[PDB]
Design an enzyme around this catalytic site. Structure first.
Site, PDB file in Angstrom:
ATOM      1  N   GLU A 206     -87.292  98.117  15.392  1.00  0.00           N
ATOM      2  CA  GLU A 206     -86.205  97.661  16.037  1.00  0.00           C
ATOM      3  C   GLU A 206     -84.641  97.850  15.260  1.00  0.00           C
ATOM      4  OE1 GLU A 206     -87.821  93.666  16.415  1.00  0.00           O
ATOM      5  OE2 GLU A 206     -87.740  94.036  18.355  1.00  0.00           O
TER       6      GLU A 206
ATOM      7  N   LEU B  92     -92.332  97.751  24.839  1.00  0.00           N
ATOM      8  CA  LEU B  92     -91.536  96.911  26.002  1.00  0.00           C
ATOM      9  C   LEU B  92     -90.545  95.717  25.277  1.00  0.00           C
ATOM     10  CD1 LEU B  92     -91.185  97.516  28.878  1.00  0.00           C
ATOM     11  CD2 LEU B  92     -93.006  96.046  29.365  1.00  0.00           C
ATOM     12  N   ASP B  93     -89.567  96.353  24.892  1.00  0.00           N
ATOM     13  CA  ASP B  93     -88.662  95.167  24.166  1.00  0.00           C
ATOM     14  C   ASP B  93     -87.944  94.155  25.036  1.00  0.00           C
ATOM     15  OD1 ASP B  93     -87.475  94.943  21.040  1.00  0.00           O
ATOM     16  OD2 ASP B  93     -85.795  94.422  22.412  1.00  0.00           O
TER      17      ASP B  93
ATOM     18  N   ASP C  25     -96.522  95.130  28.905  1.00  0.00           N
ATOM     19  CA  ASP C  25     -96.452  95.507  27.542  1.00  0.00           C
ATOM     20  C   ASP C  25     -97.624  96.270  27.134  1.00  0.00           C
ATOM     21  OD1 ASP C  25     -98.162  93.363  28.007  1.00  0.00           O
ATOM     22  OD2 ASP C  25     -97.524  92.293  26.060  1.00  0.00           O
TER      23      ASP C  25
ATOM     24  N   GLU D 139     -95.678  97.630  17.543  1.00  0.00           N
ATOM     25  CA  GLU D 139     -95.351  96.341  17.605  1.00  0.00           C
ATOM     26  C   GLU D 139     -96.375  95.192  18.331  1.00  0.00           C
ATOM     27  OE1 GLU D 139     -94.605  93.618  20.151  1.00  0.00           O
ATOM     28  OE2 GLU D 139     -92.251  93.408  20.117  1.00  0.00           O
ATOM     29  N   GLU D 140     -97.049  96.089  18.985  1.00  0.00           N
ATOM     30  CA  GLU D 140     -98.430  95.409  19.482  1.00  0.00           C
ATOM     31  C   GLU D 140     -99.516  95.425  18.750  1.00  0.00           C
ATOM     32  OE1 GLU D 140     -98.588  93.454  22.666  1.00  0.00           O
ATOM     33  OE2 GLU D 140     -96.163  93.855  23.027  1.00  0.00           O
TER      34      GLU D 140
ATOM     35  N   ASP E 173    -108.124  91.231  38.473  1.00  0.00           N
ATOM     36  CA  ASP E 173    -107.209  90.413  37.600  1.00  0.00           C
ATOM     37  C   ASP E 173    -107.255  90.357  36.364  1.00  0.00           C
ATOM     38  OD1 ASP E 173    -104.797  89.052  38.068  1.00  0.00           O
ATOM     39  OD2 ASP E 173    -105.910  87.073  38.855  1.00  0.00           O
TER      40      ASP E 173
ATOM     41  N   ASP F 139     -91.490 100.222  19.784  1.00  0.00           N
ATOM     42  CA  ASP F 139     -91.600  98.830  19.996  1.00  0.00           C
ATOM     43  C   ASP F 139     -91.492  99.423  21.707  1.00  0.00           C
ATOM     44  OD1 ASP F 139     -91.620  96.443  21.049  1.00  0.00           O
ATOM     45  OD2 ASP F 139     -89.931  95.861  19.560  1.00  0.00           O
TER      46      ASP F 139
HETATM   47  O1  LIG Z   1     -84.322  84.116  22.059  1.00  0.00           O
HETATM   48  P1  LIG Z   1     -83.986  84.845  20.662  1.00  0.00           P
HETATM   49  O2  LIG Z   1     -84.895  84.056  19.561  1.00  0.00           O
HETATM   50  O3  LIG Z   1     -82.511  84.608  20.150  1.00  0.00           O
HETATM   51  O4  LIG Z   1     -84.390  86.356  20.643  1.00  0.00           O
HETATM   52  C1  LIG Z   1     -84.202  87.689  21.375  1.00  0.00           C
HETATM   53  C2  LIG Z   1     -84.520  88.616  20.223  1.00  0.00           C
HETATM   54  O5  LIG Z   1     -85.630  88.871  20.280  1.00  0.00           O
HETATM   55  C3  LIG Z   1     -86.390  89.901  21.014  1.00  0.00           C
HETATM   56  O6  LIG Z   1     -86.244  89.669  22.381  1.00  0.00           O
HETATM   57  C4  LIG Z   1     -87.518  90.678  20.703  1.00  0.00           C
HETATM   58  O7  LIG Z   1     -88.038  91.271  21.681  1.00  0.00           O
HETATM   59  C5  LIG Z   1     -84.998  90.932  20.951  1.00  0.00           C
HETATM   60  O8  LIG Z   1     -85.036  91.834  21.834  1.00  0.00           O
HETATM   61  C6  LIG Z   1     -83.788  89.697  20.969  1.00  0.00           C
HETATM   62  O9  LIG Z   1     -82.708  90.399  20.222  1.00  0.00           O
END
Ligand SMILES: O=P(O)(O)OC[C@H]1O[C@](O)(CO)[C@@H](O)[C@@H]1O
Ligand SMILES: Nc1ncnc2c1ncn2[C@@H]1O[C@H](COP(=O)(O)O)[C@@H](O)[C@H]1O
Ligand SMILES: Nc1ncnc2c1ncn2[C@@H]1O[C@H](COP(=O)(O)O)[C@@H](O)[C@H]1O
Ligand SMILES: Nc1ncnc2c1ncn2[C@@H]1O[C@H](COP(=O)(O)O)[C@@H](O)[C@H]1O
Ligand SMILES: Nc1ncnc2c1ncn2[C@@H]1O[C@H](COP(=O)(O)O)[C@@H](O)[C@H]1O
Ligand SMILES: O=P(O)(O)OC[C@H]1O[C@](O)(CO)[C@@H](O)[C@@H]1O
Ligand SMILES: O=P(O)(O)OC[C@H]1O[C@](O)(CO)[C@@H](O)[C@@H]1O
Ligand SMILES: O=P(O)(O)OC[C@H]1O[C@](O)(CO)[C@@H](O)[C@@H]1O
Lengths: 337, 337, 337, 337
Positions: free
Chosen positions: D280, D120-121, D74, D97-98, D68, D118
């Site tokens: 991004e 796992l966006d 990510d 990004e990480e 675990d 990035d």
């Molecule tokens: O909920 P929020 O603050 O509007 O953000 C979502 C934004 O941030 C992210 O989730 C970053 O991972 C973007 O993919 C997205 O545009």
């Protein structure tokens, strides 16, 4: 009767197992067992085909994830089986090839079934990617005494269900019960087993024999004579073709499909043969018989041998009735006093 | 460490082929070719495993998507290869086991390589889910005339790359080019071939002989004497175990990994052997010699035979060098004039 | 009680559905139904992820195989559902989004269940790869008259089972019955649904609202006020986050998981909203309620509306109890005379 | 026909990249790079879909393989990319990004490309199975000093290739390089990306606006006036529909295919926007401009911003040119001095 209709039949193993249970008015304990078996097989198939191998080879730099030592398709397959079977709350005893002792299912998880299985058969030669498989035999516990090793010692004549999973060029689960033998092909894309063959019957006479002739030096005269008659036919007929994979499930399945005879007789080194009775012989003999073939040790039918040890070995000859018979006559001929 | 050459990381077939191209200062034509085989094998593999068989069995109705009698794995596999190959712009002529005639590539898609392949090998016997394969051999078009069948008639010795894919318990592509032999394991989950065995070399001597003894009635005295000496060793050593799947790619592969000898000699009732030269014998021989084995027809070396026809057959014997030489000795012992 | 043990719980949907049926002492008709639903979902998932797309694009030169016209994930998904459900011999009537008429299952295949489903929801916008899904509702036929369209016209309060399959970054089947809501993640490698969440309860108050504000011009004062209170909070608290995918299942699931409120109210163009009652609203409302949330039309609970047409539309607001309530109070406030 | 350029056949990402390399007379370094991303995306895709989740849930026991709290999609995705990338021998510096710091590649594996990604966006929100992605941008190391973080600080205008993979109802890799934008559909069955859309160009004007209105309380007057004009069109036209997933790759992709405008402006409570520039904003902008759209920060163009830090944030607006210009007008209408 005559079923007349607008009928499309995409029969999956799950639908089948359930219906058959409905007919039998079972409490569904065996249904859950069989359903659990189906799930174990699929997981093994997936592992056997090396899905995820890229990770052992550090595609993502094995930080530790699966851990340092071996996950031998051999033992992994074992754990997958025992685990999946115990969680079905339907087995009281398990007897496996990889385990010295009969595993007694925890009281909290006990059922009234005993399963004798071979997790990964033919595994010794997986390096050359030979077809391997899973063999299973199921008995119903015949007593009230606490489930012990002894409950597994029942002749193959007592099996309620038996069969195998062939991981060859594709995966197939051949299931045999009192009502017959059926084959299910695994569509790996949806993880379902499709009935591809219903009520599988074996040919009366086949034209292929299967035996590891390297042991020709230690073969008994009955075998040596039959084999000679297969190559050089005295009616000047066409000789038999030969083929021996070295993996029981693959050889037995080829026999079931095209017909012929498979043999793994007694030779001076293994006076009682190499194939173990409970989890290899019995299951294949049971399948063979429901399929319409014969399965003998040379002297007696395999399904009638009362075992004395769970890891007992036993010679075996099985296949089309006319061939098995033809060989048995030779045994009777050379049997004397 | 003084290694400008590392194996602690993960190497895919695609990275591998490409590196090998940069080194060879290729124009990149053979790489698009090898990359096309890779995509081809992956596609046929998926089909062999029966991914999608549900649709054929009516899971959504066998309207016009299922219908019938049209798609025969072998035909599909043929199509996939021919097609994925033309679409590489690297081949000028393709010889197929399923095609009576050599296929000349449209001048638009025309390249410079001649590819000989056997799309689904061992597929008469696929019903019993026996391991099958695909075999390929590639020549460089050594001519200036309008490409034709004659470009395919080059002795095995002129191959630039050859290899095969075995669809067994797992999918493996063994590739042999000028430098050596390498085995790539298909991780079906990611559709990528991983390098698991580099510079494969066969054993000098093995303990397994492979041949269809159903034909023992029609073997020449050399083959006969050999088989005999394996079962009943004259120097009182342990006999050679036997194994025979009846699928070239499978037996050849078992032979490559565990050593031993595979034989499919000129069996009376088919005087020129049964295995075809261009797309079965030559590639396996090329691989074999590259792994350190021998590939003889009994009299001559397989790779040196000058083909007279693209569908020409030839007897063949291959495997560990000590075993193959031993039979050759027996072959000399028995005739000349 | 307190279960104390050595227990490992790898609970699959099949094991679950079966056990639950055992407890209920059902004849197993619903078991087969649910088992059939699980199989339809998996097949759809597979198609939605474009497995096999390479063939539409002639990887093997579409000789005809799948045929010339369209296999619109839209209609294909429909056929997969109807087909798989009819073969379960457990449904008497089917009501689908894609079908104008209620399909009366052939007499030979009838059962006592009625299923209202949406094969591929959110499909209109599949081109941008948005999360789509399947919605299903099951009623037990409440009569003896020949199964007709009329049997589908039962309030959602009468559903025996309901749920959905979300084909998002992964596939999930959320199943809700009288006993509760459970989530099952599909391990696509073995084609099994694993219980990943048991007895799913929704948060009392969420911090996200979901609505297509482009219709702000046609929103009624109750909605317009709530929304304003979400952005500009009068206690100067933190405003709500907004998020609207445009696919009901995706929006509803995000509401179930993180909590909040989803709304698809009545606007002047669709006085009765866009979402259809029987196969979208009811199922989601039922899920919501078993999960501990609220699902209203603004005036009354959705589950209590007695339908008059199978394709009847209905406004809907669902989500955490505190938010749904907070909005309903506004409705009561602006409701007059 | 005078087409030295054909689309009637099947084109995979691998064939495509390679052809593009031959044309560009590349040394083949960027191709090994693009080929590595392809393998990376495939691996992360498989993980996102949860293939293998059974093992984690004990299908074979969560001994040490499950254990675990260690593998977070990510983190795994990060590892896969960094690792598969280093193993290309084509990158010198990687910005993640990480990772707090830029990663400088060991001189042995060191190449010439700088990759910003990035992994796992949209993966804070993955619990509700929302579509997620991976974003990448590649610069050519334009310096001679020992590679360092500074090589990553090049304005978006200097990118050689950029793109992203969206893991939604299906997996798609959109790749934009100097010539144009191309969309490749992942056929998960064969692990190959197919070319389905060539030279993607965005609409001039679309009918959808995307923004998180939960922040309406903190938008500048230009954004506020714009949103208003979409809901309540002054020229009495039909209002713009709204849609917001909360995942960049998903919204950006919806915007690319259906047209419209996506906005994530400088929201008080985070004055520099929230989206990061290097991995991004820049890539999506590069794609956008390549598809024929605009990518503005409100005042300037995203691609021209000179980064001061690798983890720098920036407000962004992108989409159809007519819509993006319209907001820019409003932006001028409201301030300067
Ligand atoms: O909920 P929020 O603050 O509007 O953000 C979502 C934004 O941030 C992210 O989730 C970053 O991972 C973007 O993919 C997205 O545009
Ligand atoms: N497909 C099947 N599923 C369940 N029970 C079956 C099936 N086929 C036959 N039966 C019989 O039903 C009996 C009852 O066992 P049980 O359900 O454990 O109480 C089984 O032992 C079988 O003999
Ligand atoms: N992976 C490889 N790709 C291209 N050529 C290679 C490869 N490995 C070795 N070669 C040699 O390089 C030659 C160059 O041919 P070509 O790519 O068409 O220009 C080939 O015929 C081979 O002999
Ligand atoms: N998991 C389930 N499987 C089958 N029956 C169930 C299940 N859960 C509850 N039951 C009840 O058993 C009833 C009997 O229906 P049947 O099996 O068709 O005769 C069903 O309608 C359900 O109300
Ligand atoms: N598919 C491609 N492979 C290699 N280079 C390409 C490709 N498409 C365009 N290029 C251009 O060719 C240059 C050659 O770089 P390199 O391969 O390292 O020698 C790259 O930086 C790109 O600008
Ligand atoms: O090839 P041999 O030595 O005759 O024995 C192999 C046999 O052993 C087994 O692996 C198990 O006893 C079988 O699958 C197989 O038929
Ligand atoms: O049964 P036979 O005649 O011995 O032939 C099997 C041989 O022919 C082939 O099946 C040809 O496909 C080979 O793979 C194999 O070596
Ligand atoms: O985006 P809109 O126009 O508000 O409506 C979309 C709605 O329509 C549906 O496709 C079905 O009615 C839903 O999945 C979705 O919530």
């Amino acid at each position: 009767t005559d079923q007349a209709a607008f009928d499309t039949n995409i029969v999956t193993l799950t639908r089948f197992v359930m219906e058959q249970g409905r007919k039998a008015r079972g409490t569904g304990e065996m249904t859950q067992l069989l359903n659990s078996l189906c799930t174990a097989v699929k997981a093994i198939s997936t592992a056997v085909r090396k899905a995820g191998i890229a990770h052992l080879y550090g595609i993502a730099g094995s930080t530790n994830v699966t851990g340092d030592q071996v996950k031998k398709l051999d033992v992994l397959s074992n754990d997958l089986v025992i685990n999946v079977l115990k969680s079905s709350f339907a087995t009281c005893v398990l007897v496996t090839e990889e385990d010295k002792n009969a595993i007694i299912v925890e009281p909290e998880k006990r059922g009234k079934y005993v399963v004798c299985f071979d997790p990964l058969d033919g595994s010794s030669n997986i390096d050359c990617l030979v077809s391997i498989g899973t063999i299973f035999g199921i008995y119903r516990k015949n007593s009230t005494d606490e489930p012990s090793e002894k409950d597994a010692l029942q002749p193959g004549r007592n099996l309620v269900a038996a069969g195998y999973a062939l991981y060859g060029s594709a995966t197939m689960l051949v299931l045999a019960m009192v009502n017959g033998v059926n084959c299910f092909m695994l569509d790996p894309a949806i993880g379902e087993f499709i009935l591809v063959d219903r009520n599988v019957k074996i040919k009366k006479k086949g034209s292929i024999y299967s035996i590891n002739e390297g042991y020709a030096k230690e073969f008994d005269p009955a075998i040596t004579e039959y084999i000679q008659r297969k190559k050089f036919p005295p009616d000047n007929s066409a000789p038999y073709g030969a083929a021996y994979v070295g993996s029981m499930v693959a050889d037995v399945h080829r026999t079931l499909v095209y017909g012929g005879i498979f043999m793994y007789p007694a030779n001076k080194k293994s006076p009682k043969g190499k194939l173990r009775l409970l989890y290899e012989c019995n299951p294949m003999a049971y399948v063979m018989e429901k399929a319409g073939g014969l399965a003998t040790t040379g002297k007696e039918a395999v399904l009638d041998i009362v075992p004395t040890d769970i890891h007992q070995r036993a010679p075996i000859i099985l296949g089309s009735p006319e061939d098995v018979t033809e060989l048995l006559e030779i045994y009777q001929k050379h049997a004397a006093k």
